[PDB]
Design a protein around this ligand. Structure first.
Ligand SMILES: [K+]
Ligand SMILES: [Mg+2]
Ligand SMILES: [Mg+2]
Ligand SMILES: [Zn+2]
Ligand SMILES: [Zn+2]
Ligand SMILES: [Zn+2]
Length: 144
RNA sequence: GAUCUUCGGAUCACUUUGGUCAAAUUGAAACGAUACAGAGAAGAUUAGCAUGGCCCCUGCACAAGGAUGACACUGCGACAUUGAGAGAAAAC
């Protein structure tokens, strides 16, 4: 993950996108330091937020604007700058706007069911449109 | 929203919330100190191992320690009464 001055030089298309990744890292640090205003699980929601956003940025670089070479993209996934499993989920129908990967797997729930965010809002009542407790998600379903 | 399909629709996904319990006087324990006595076995100094359980503490322990860890170690009536006398009473 961490790169030294004497490490192998990343592929060519890296430097122009290096600064924004640096900004992502900076704010992740700030979120780590920032404390208060939530329950034991709510304070850990913004982490997944930024993480999904960062992975989506890389996904947008490759699959929507073809701004990065395939070599650089494999390098980025190998350096954990993006979550390979989350991107794999984004590449199949029904999970285009997946929030995180803990809201899809059923072994982490009380009754073996996915999260509320995975459910389309059309069949969900108006009153029970609440923030996810896993990551604060406000609706994953591809329809919305 | 993506995919087809023919502008009828079909696919793809589909219900969270670990809760000694709401931002700390008044529902997570157990005591400091001061004041009193103040160290087992029939004189005195003193080794210990035990018995009993709504007494525990240290210990990983079915070792061993904590004053021999401490407290306790007793005691009574399924007694049948007649054996006899005396004054009274009621009775040989
Ligand atoms: K002694
Ligand atoms: Mg002993
Ligand atoms: Mg003893
Ligand atoms: Zn979600
Ligand atoms: Zn999630
Ligand atoms: Zn969720």
């Amino acid at each position: 993950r961490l790169r030294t001055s004497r490490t192998k030089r990343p592929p060519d298309g890296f430097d122009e996108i290096e600064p924004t990744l640096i900004e992502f890292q900076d704010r992740m640090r700030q979120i780590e330091n920032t404390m208060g205003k939530g329950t034991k699980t709510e304070m850990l929601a913004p982490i997944f937020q930024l993480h999904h956003q960062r992975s989506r940025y890389i996904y947008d670089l490759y699959y929507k604007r073809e701004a990065i070479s395939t070599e650089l993209y494999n390098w980025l996934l190998k350096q954990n700058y993006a979550d390979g499993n989350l991107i794999a989920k984004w590449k199949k129908p029904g999970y285009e706007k997946l929030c995180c990967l803990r809201c899809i797997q059923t072994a982490e729930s009380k009754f073996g069911s996915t999260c509320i965010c995975r459910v389309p809002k059309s069949k969900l009542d108006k009153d029970q449109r609440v923030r996810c407790t896993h990551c604060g998600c406000n609706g994953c379903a591809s329809c919305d």
